[PDB]
Amino acid sequence: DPKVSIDELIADPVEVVRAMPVVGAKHDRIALPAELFGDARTNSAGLDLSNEETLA
Amino acid sequence: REAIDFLRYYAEQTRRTLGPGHGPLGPIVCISPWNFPLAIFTGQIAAALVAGNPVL
Amino acid sequence: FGGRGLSGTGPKAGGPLYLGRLVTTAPVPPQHSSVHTDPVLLDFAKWLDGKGARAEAEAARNAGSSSALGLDLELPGPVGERNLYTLHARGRILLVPATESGLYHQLAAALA
Amino acid sequence: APAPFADFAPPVRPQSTLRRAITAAYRRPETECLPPLVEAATQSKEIRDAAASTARKLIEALRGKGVEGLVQEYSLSSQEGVALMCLAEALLRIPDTATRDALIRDKIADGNWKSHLRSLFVNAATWGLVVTGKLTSTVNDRSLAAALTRLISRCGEPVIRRGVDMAMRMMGEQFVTGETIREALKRSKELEEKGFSYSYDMLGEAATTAADAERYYRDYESAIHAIGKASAGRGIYEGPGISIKLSALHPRYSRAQAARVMGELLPRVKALALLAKNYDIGLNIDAEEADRLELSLDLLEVLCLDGDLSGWNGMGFVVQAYGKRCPFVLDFIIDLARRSGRRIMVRLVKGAYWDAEIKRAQLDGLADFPVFTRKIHTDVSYIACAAKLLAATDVVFPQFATHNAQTLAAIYHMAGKDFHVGKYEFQCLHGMGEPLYEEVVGRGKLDRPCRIYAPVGTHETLLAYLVRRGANSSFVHRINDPKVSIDELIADPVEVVRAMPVVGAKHDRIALPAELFGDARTNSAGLDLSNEETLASLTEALRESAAMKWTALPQLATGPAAGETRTVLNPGDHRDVVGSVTETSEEDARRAVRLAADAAPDWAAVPPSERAACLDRAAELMQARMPTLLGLIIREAGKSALNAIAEVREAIDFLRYYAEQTRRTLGPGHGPLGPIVCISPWNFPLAIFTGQIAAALVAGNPVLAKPAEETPLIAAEGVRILREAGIPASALQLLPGDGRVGAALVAAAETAGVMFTGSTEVARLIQAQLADRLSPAGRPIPLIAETGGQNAMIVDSSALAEQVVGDVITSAFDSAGQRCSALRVLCLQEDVADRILTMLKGALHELHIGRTDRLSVDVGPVITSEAKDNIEKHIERMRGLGRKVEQIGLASETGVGTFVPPTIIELEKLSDLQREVFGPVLHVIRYRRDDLDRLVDDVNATGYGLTFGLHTRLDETIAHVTSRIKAGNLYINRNIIGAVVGVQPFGGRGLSGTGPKAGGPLYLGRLVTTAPVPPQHSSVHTDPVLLDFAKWLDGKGARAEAEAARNAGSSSALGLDLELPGPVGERNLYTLHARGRILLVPATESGLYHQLAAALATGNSVAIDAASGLQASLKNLPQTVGLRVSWSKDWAADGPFAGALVEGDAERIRAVNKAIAALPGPLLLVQAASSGEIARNPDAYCLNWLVEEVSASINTAAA
Ligand SMILES: Cc1cc2nc3c(=O)[nH]c(=O)nc-3n(C[C@H](O)[C@H](O)[C@H](O)COP(=O)(O)OP(=O)(O)OC[C@H]3O[C@@H](n4cnc5c(N)ncnc54)[C@H](O)[C@@H]3O)c2cc1C
Ligand SMILES: NC(=S)Nc1ccc(F)cc1
């Protein structure tokens, strides 16, 4: 992409993350499964049948 | 999960719509099948109840 | 969820028209509207005004506006899926009128 | 006899060095503007540190302290909140409080809201922006009506009462300081006691009529007295002042009208300034669009040098930092302050018209934007200009208008520690800026004064331009964004810009005007008639064009020919000889066709890409020669300078568009038709001339170019340029003359196609001549005929009257109404008809009619004395019938030419208009809202269908009207003229043309024997009746025909729906619909099945010739198909048709073609094939010509 500069491509992800206001914040545009419907209602939750804690 | 979703969905649709002028029918008979013995059981009953009808 | 014909009466379970069937006066569902006006409804309203059926012509225009025929919505769901919800004509409606004005109102409702 | 162009556009005054440096910067590249701004805005490390600390303290205070609470309390959706506020607005229009409360309790809260209360939702776009922060140009009124019913039925009277209270506080206290100057002055006492001052804005702008300008004047005058009485001698710094907009004070405030501006607007501003002087209050001239900047400087200079205003320093002037001229404007103002001895109050702002400036520059094809395209550049400009102002506080009073805490902090620290009242001040808007400046004003804060810009006006005026008064880039929006840190807000724009890879790079997502079409083609370039350097250069080029010995000769392949020579006269002044034309003999016209036939193989053998290169080279020559071509068009055709620019641009666009379409499509299998006769009109004597010729030439055909008798000189110059670009003389022959020349060309045996733009009557005569002939392959001779229209605009009660009037004045009277697209019938909803008509008449009388070699002329002459008499006979007949007729008085100087005064005629019914009147004559009818659908029927019933306009904010009305109107070019919330090549492909249906659209992708395919597949031309939609018909065919055993039908369903492009690239603030849509009812003339059963398949696959119904005897071939059709099929014994009784499909041998085809040409109404596009061709060729009939192209152009900046 001619828009992206070498400075952008060379940025250190470790230091960019360290400087964020909440380290490790979820992507703003990706809904947690519980939040798929926004403020309308809470999505039902399932169970992970691949999780050994859950199976036990 | 579907039973939970029915409950929460008809709850939210009620909060969005129902007013004093939306009078109930009265006693509603809810007859449900054996293949979705909780989810369709719950969906029909929850809808009838939240609309202000007592259910058989 | 729910179909037509031998599959059921509707309205769809888990959809926005469901609760309205369970009250004596149905509410306006969320997002339930359409900017489309059925063109045969419009032709019927002009015919009614040519007759001087002013009350019915007005009723027909109001039916044409409040109809949600043509609604076309995307419903929120998971990524990698598009979930659409649309309102179409039902088909042929049986009209059992008693009076001329009753028939005009019924026809307006069906055409709209 | 005045010398041509001797008075074209003389400047108000000789341009000083300082004024010239302003003009030079008008559209300077952004990469050249920014580096000196960066340097000027550069501050020391310590100052930048202190500034970042101050901005952090202010932004922290701001974050640690309405409609949102109402939405929350009642669990309202966004649409419900908007609908509620629209309902509250309407309830507040009820005068008496107890009446309103009774209606709420006894009627509204019971759901009966439609009964008592124009749509409720006319201003929903504004409330939408209030509620959601998002703007839309139009309003989904069905969604809002559903939401309003829902929320009332759910929450009842309590939510209505809360909405009413909220809207009342916002409209009477938050959007405006006060409803009247008296009220606003009473409400200012509080913050004045806390150290603020005020500047009152009476909200006038963009006067449309003399009466509007006078109303705004008397509003300003009364406010000045009220403010001066309240000021009570506090002076211009501590006391309140007023802000005025020059556009409010004259209906024609523009550079083109500079003489009227200096003679009529200037004395008005002087009278207001004299009253402000007497009370010793500030009077600030607000800044408006970029093309008014330098004109406003001429007024500022006169006022500041006027001795009657001496002794008063209250005169103020706004400069916009988003403008590239801003620092040079400041240099000029500071020097003016020194010369005059007046301490000019200079309000530095960023600027309020950004979106409109981007759109305008793109529309006008100008070199660059007059504003920056990156918000951060505007911020650097602001700081840079503030530095210049702070160095000049001894001679000007700087006023730093900003809500941006970082900008504020930077300036505060830049100004240093020495301060006193009168050195400089900050400014902010009422409602918006007080939270910030409460942290600034006062000895306990930053101890810097702030002046509050206080809008004053009622609910009508406020809601008008409140939208312009919340974008993602705005500080006020970003400070409210929780995902924006303070560190992002206190970031130094100066140091951010300095570290970018290319300082001053244009915004990546905004196209320069020349790049509007990307890699497809280079946009044509215009000229800026507000730029004094351009006007000076153009004046000289225009005078030179009038010293040229323009000629037009019959230019045959063998050389020029002799003939009868006559002079060509300026229609605006018959004393002004423009040139001479030598007209073609009937014998030489026929000789030219034979010469063109002889040369046809040679030109067809030139590879399509090289033919396109000729067109592209011609476009470059026309662009380079534009100033000279303008001069010829102005004098030969009677056009104004702006319209000649558009005409030359349109010619360039056609050349480049058809060149690119050729490079996209044409190969060796797309053989030319042969010699094409191109007959062009006098109203677009270069653009339509060039378009037809270029299309035919690039499709591989040699051309016989017959220009209108009235306008041969620009045609000859167009041919000269095309030959210079490489078109051989044998491929392009010019044949000037009258209809005898046109008729000889059309009748010549080797004529293989005719392109005609002109009257319907002449087009019908050409069709009759062509129906006698067949091509060498036995097909009808193609005719592309673009004819008139009876074009209408429908305006409902939701439209903005001022926007309607400007679009109506332009659409009806531009080019003296001699556009095929010109607005002929305006339909006004009855509730707003009187108000709009009054404004329209007032606007009519502000037009300047005269010889067009003056920039001040709005409307020129009609083309001939015959045109004038025809138009005036219509007007007198209407007046004779007692219709109300409004006309402007013409100057005596018009007697030397042929002028018709712009005219408004009020009709009882659309049926009163029974003829096309090709002149500046607007007919007006009124309609009731419930009759809208019938009105659309009345418009359609004319049989025309070229251009159509709709002004409404209501989506339900848009959907209804645009689905019912039958017109080729639709325009929503804009004028209906000036269709742009490749953007609004142009061409109508019915009596308005055959199609295909000029400047569209089907055009070239009509000019070859085998049409190519156009770019982007396909559809995934299959007509369902076609599908029913194919199954029926299979049921009957017609298996091959069923397969051909399925293939037709797939190949059809019915349902194509494209958005075409164009300027920002507009959506341009291109769609393919069914044409209507196609006349089928079959010979065999299989031929009928193939014809029906072609018609059904393109969405059409059919009328089948009953004389074919093929009725038994369609037994037991599915009802869906039967609904589409009728049988016709009397073709002329069962029309109008939209096309025809014919099967037969050559004699049968000729006989049918002649019978179809005799059908009244539209010229039918006829396709013919033999029975054997139907069997052999799947494309025997071409589906391109069985659909209808529709172009829709929607103004999305309209709210
Ligand atoms: C008291 C007062 C009087 C005013 N008078 C006038 C007037 O007479 N004429 C006038 O035109 N304006 C005037 N304005 C300014 C205008 O109305 C806006 O209020 C002002 O531009 C907001 O800028 P800011 O420093 O508040 O906010 P910010 O968020 O700092 O600045 C926003 C501004 O940046 C600019 N901008 C946004 N995006 C871009 C971009 N992509 N490229 C380039 N620039 C961009 C725009 O000018 C926008 O208004 C006045 C403002 C005030 C406070
Ligand atoms: N003014 C012109 S060119 N008229 C014309 C052309 C061809 C024809 F058949 C009849 C008339």
Side-chain angles (χ1 to χ4, degrees), chain D residues 138-160 162-168:
Chain D
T138 58
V139 156
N140 185 334
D141 43 323
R142 293 326 302 158
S143 182
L144 291 170
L148 186 56
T149 295
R150 190 181 319 103
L151 75 89
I152 292 174
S153 295
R154 183 174 80 246
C155 306
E157 183 181 327
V159 73
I160 298 167
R162 284 277 274 109
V164 165
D165 295 341
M166 184 75 61
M168 193 187 248

Short mmCIF file of all heavy atoms in Angstrom, two decimals, chain D residues 138-168, unseen atoms left out:
data_model
loop_
_atom_site.label_atom_id
_atom_site.label_comp_id
_atom_site.label_asym_id
_atom_site.label_seq_id
_atom_site.Cartn_x
_atom_site.Cartn_y
_atom_site.Cartn_z
N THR D 138 -32.07 13.65 3.76
CA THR D 138 -33.51 13.44 3.78
C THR D 138 -33.90 12.55 4.96
O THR D 138 -33.07 11.96 5.64
CB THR D 138 -34.00 12.84 2.45
OG1 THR D 138 -33.32 11.60 2.20
CG2 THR D 138 -33.74 13.80 1.31
N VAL D 139 -35.21 12.45 5.15
CA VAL D 139 -35.81 12.04 6.40
C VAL D 139 -36.67 10.81 6.13
O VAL D 139 -37.47 10.83 5.19
CB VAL D 139 -36.65 13.20 6.97
CG1 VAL D 139 -37.73 12.72 7.90
CG2 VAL D 139 -35.72 14.25 7.62
N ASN D 140 -36.50 9.76 6.93
CA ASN D 140 -37.36 8.58 6.74
C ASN D 140 -38.62 8.82 7.56
O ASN D 140 -38.71 8.46 8.74
CB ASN D 140 -36.65 7.28 7.14
CG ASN D 140 -37.50 6.03 6.84
OD1 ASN D 140 -38.75 6.08 6.80
ND2 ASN D 140 -36.84 4.90 6.62
N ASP D 141 -39.60 9.46 6.91
CA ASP D 141 -40.79 9.88 7.65
C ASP D 141 -41.69 8.72 8.02
O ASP D 141 -42.47 8.84 8.97
CB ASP D 141 -41.60 10.93 6.86
CG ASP D 141 -41.74 10.62 5.36
OD1 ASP D 141 -40.80 10.10 4.73
OD2 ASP D 141 -42.82 10.95 4.81
N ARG D 142 -41.61 7.59 7.31
CA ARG D 142 -42.41 6.44 7.71
C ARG D 142 -41.84 5.80 8.96
O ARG D 142 -42.59 5.38 9.86
CB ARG D 142 -42.49 5.41 6.57
CG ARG D 142 -43.27 5.89 5.35
CD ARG D 142 -44.43 6.80 5.72
NE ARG D 142 -45.39 6.18 6.63
CZ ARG D 142 -46.22 6.87 7.41
NH1 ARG D 142 -46.24 8.20 7.39
NH2 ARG D 142 -47.04 6.22 8.23
N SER D 143 -40.50 5.74 9.05
CA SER D 143 -39.84 5.28 10.27
C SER D 143 -40.18 6.18 11.45
O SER D 143 -40.45 5.70 12.56
CB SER D 143 -38.32 5.26 10.06
OG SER D 143 -37.66 4.78 11.21
N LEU D 144 -40.13 7.49 11.23
CA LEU D 144 -40.40 8.43 12.32
C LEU D 144 -41.87 8.39 12.74
O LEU D 144 -42.19 8.51 13.93
CB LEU D 144 -40.00 9.84 11.89
CG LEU D 144 -38.49 10.05 11.73
CD1 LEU D 144 -38.22 11.37 11.09
CD2 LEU D 144 -37.77 9.93 13.08
N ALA D 145 -42.78 8.23 11.78
CA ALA D 145 -44.20 8.14 12.14
C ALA D 145 -44.48 6.88 12.95
O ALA D 145 -45.21 6.92 13.94
CB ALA D 145 -45.07 8.19 10.89
N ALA D 146 -43.88 5.75 12.55
CA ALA D 146 -43.98 4.53 13.35
C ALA D 146 -43.40 4.74 14.75
O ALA D 146 -43.99 4.31 15.74
CB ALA D 146 -43.27 3.37 12.64
N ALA D 147 -42.24 5.40 14.83
CA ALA D 147 -41.61 5.60 16.13
C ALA D 147 -42.48 6.48 17.03
O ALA D 147 -42.63 6.20 18.22
CB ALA D 147 -40.22 6.22 15.97
N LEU D 148 -43.06 7.53 16.46
CA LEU D 148 -43.87 8.45 17.26
C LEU D 148 -45.11 7.74 17.80
O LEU D 148 -45.44 7.85 18.99
CB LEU D 148 -44.25 9.66 16.42
CG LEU D 148 -44.97 10.77 17.18
CD1 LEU D 148 -44.14 11.22 18.37
CD2 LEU D 148 -45.25 11.94 16.25
N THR D 149 -45.81 6.99 16.94
CA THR D 149 -46.94 6.18 17.40
C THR D 149 -46.51 5.22 18.50
O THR D 149 -47.17 5.11 19.54
CB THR D 149 -47.54 5.42 16.22
OG1 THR D 149 -48.09 6.35 15.28
CG2 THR D 149 -48.65 4.44 16.68
N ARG D 150 -45.39 4.52 18.29
CA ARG D 150 -44.92 3.55 19.27
C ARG D 150 -44.66 4.21 20.62
O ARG D 150 -45.13 3.73 21.66
CB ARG D 150 -43.65 2.85 18.77
CG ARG D 150 -43.22 1.66 19.62
CD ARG D 150 -41.93 0.99 19.11
NE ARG D 150 -41.84 0.87 17.66
CZ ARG D 150 -41.09 1.65 16.88
NH1 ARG D 150 -40.40 2.67 17.38
NH2 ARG D 150 -41.03 1.39 15.57
N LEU D 151 -43.92 5.33 20.63
CA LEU D 151 -43.53 5.91 21.91
C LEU D 151 -44.73 6.53 22.63
O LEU D 151 -44.80 6.48 23.86
CB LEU D 151 -42.41 6.93 21.71
CG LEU D 151 -42.74 8.30 21.12
CD1 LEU D 151 -43.10 9.29 22.24
CD2 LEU D 151 -41.58 8.85 20.30
N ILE D 152 -45.66 7.11 21.89
CA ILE D 152 -46.84 7.66 22.54
C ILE D 152 -47.70 6.54 23.12
O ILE D 152 -48.16 6.62 24.26
CB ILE D 152 -47.63 8.55 21.55
CG1 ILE D 152 -46.81 9.80 21.23
CG2 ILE D 152 -48.98 8.93 22.14
CD1 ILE D 152 -47.41 10.68 20.15
N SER D 153 -47.90 5.46 22.35
CA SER D 153 -48.72 4.36 22.85
C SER D 153 -48.10 3.69 24.07
O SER D 153 -48.81 3.13 24.89
CB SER D 153 -48.94 3.32 21.75
OG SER D 153 -49.70 3.85 20.67
N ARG D 154 -46.77 3.75 24.20
CA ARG D 154 -46.04 3.10 25.28
C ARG D 154 -45.91 3.99 26.52
O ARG D 154 -46.07 3.52 27.65
CB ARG D 154 -44.64 2.70 24.79
CG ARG D 154 -43.78 1.94 25.81
CD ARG D 154 -42.46 1.45 25.18
NE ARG D 154 -41.46 2.51 25.09
CZ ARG D 154 -40.98 3.04 23.97
NH1 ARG D 154 -41.34 2.58 22.77
NH2 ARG D 154 -40.12 4.05 24.04
N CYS D 155 -45.63 5.28 26.32
CA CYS D 155 -45.31 6.17 27.44
C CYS D 155 -46.34 7.27 27.67
O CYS D 155 -46.34 7.85 28.76
CB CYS D 155 -43.93 6.81 27.23
SG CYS D 155 -42.57 5.61 26.93
N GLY D 156 -47.19 7.58 26.70
CA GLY D 156 -48.28 8.52 26.96
C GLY D 156 -47.86 9.97 27.17
O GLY D 156 -46.77 10.42 26.79
N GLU D 157 -48.78 10.73 27.77
CA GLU D 157 -48.57 12.16 28.01
C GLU D 157 -47.25 12.50 28.71
O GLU D 157 -46.64 13.51 28.35
CB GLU D 157 -49.77 12.70 28.80
CG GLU D 157 -49.74 14.19 29.07
CD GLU D 157 -50.96 14.63 29.87
OE1 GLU D 157 -52.04 14.03 29.68
OE2 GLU D 157 -50.85 15.57 30.69
N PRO D 158 -46.78 11.74 29.72
CA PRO D 158 -45.53 12.14 30.38
C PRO D 158 -44.35 12.34 29.45
O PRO D 158 -43.55 13.27 29.66
CB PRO D 158 -45.29 10.98 31.36
CG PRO D 158 -46.66 10.55 31.74
CD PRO D 158 -47.47 10.67 30.47
N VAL D 159 -44.19 11.50 28.43
CA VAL D 159 -43.05 11.68 27.55
C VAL D 159 -43.26 12.86 26.60
O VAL D 159 -42.30 13.51 26.20
CB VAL D 159 -42.74 10.36 26.80
CG1 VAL D 159 -43.78 10.09 25.71
CG2 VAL D 159 -41.33 10.39 26.25
N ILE D 160 -44.51 13.15 26.22
CA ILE D 160 -44.80 14.30 25.37
C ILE D 160 -44.48 15.60 26.12
O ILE D 160 -43.83 16.50 25.58
CB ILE D 160 -46.27 14.26 24.92
CG1 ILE D 160 -46.55 13.00 24.09
CG2 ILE D 160 -46.64 15.51 24.12
CD1 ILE D 160 -48.01 12.73 23.87
N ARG D 161 -44.91 15.69 27.37
CA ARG D 161 -44.62 16.87 28.18
C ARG D 161 -43.11 17.07 28.37
O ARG D 161 -42.61 18.20 28.27
CB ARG D 161 -45.32 16.76 29.54
N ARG D 162 -42.37 15.99 28.62
CA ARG D 162 -40.92 16.10 28.74
C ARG D 162 -40.27 16.51 27.42
O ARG D 162 -39.32 17.31 27.41
CB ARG D 162 -40.34 14.77 29.23
CG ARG D 162 -40.56 14.54 30.71
CD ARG D 162 -39.51 15.27 31.54
NE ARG D 162 -38.31 14.45 31.70
CZ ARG D 162 -37.14 14.69 31.11
NH1 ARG D 162 -36.96 15.75 30.34
NH2 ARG D 162 -36.13 13.84 31.31
N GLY D 163 -40.74 15.96 26.30
CA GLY D 163 -40.20 16.40 25.03
C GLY D 163 -40.43 17.88 24.79
O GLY D 163 -39.52 18.61 24.38
N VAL D 164 -41.64 18.35 25.08
CA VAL D 164 -41.97 19.76 24.87
C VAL D 164 -41.06 20.65 25.71
O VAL D 164 -40.56 21.67 25.23
CB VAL D 164 -43.46 20.01 25.18
CG1 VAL D 164 -43.73 21.50 25.33
CG2 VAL D 164 -44.33 19.39 24.10
N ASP D 165 -40.83 20.27 26.96
CA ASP D 165 -39.95 21.07 27.82
C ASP D 165 -38.53 21.08 27.28
O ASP D 165 -37.87 22.13 27.27
CB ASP D 165 -39.99 20.54 29.25
CG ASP D 165 -41.35 20.71 29.90
OD1 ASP D 165 -42.16 21.53 29.41
OD2 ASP D 165 -41.62 20.02 30.90
N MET D 166 -38.05 19.93 26.80
CA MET D 166 -36.69 19.87 26.27
C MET D 166 -36.54 20.73 25.02
O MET D 166 -35.59 21.50 24.89
CB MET D 166 -36.32 18.41 25.97
CG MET D 166 -34.89 18.23 25.49
SD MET D 166 -33.73 18.39 26.86
CE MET D 166 -34.29 17.03 27.89
N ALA D 167 -37.48 20.59 24.07
CA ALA D 167 -37.37 21.36 22.84
C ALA D 167 -37.46 22.86 23.10
O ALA D 167 -36.82 23.65 22.41
CB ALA D 167 -38.44 20.94 21.83
N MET D 168 -38.24 23.25 24.11
CA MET D 168 -38.41 24.67 24.42
C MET D 168 -37.13 25.27 24.99
O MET D 168 -36.77 26.40 24.65
CB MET D 168 -39.57 24.85 25.40
CG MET D 168 -40.03 26.29 25.56
SD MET D 168 -41.25 26.46 26.88
CE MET D 168 -42.73 26.88 25.95
#
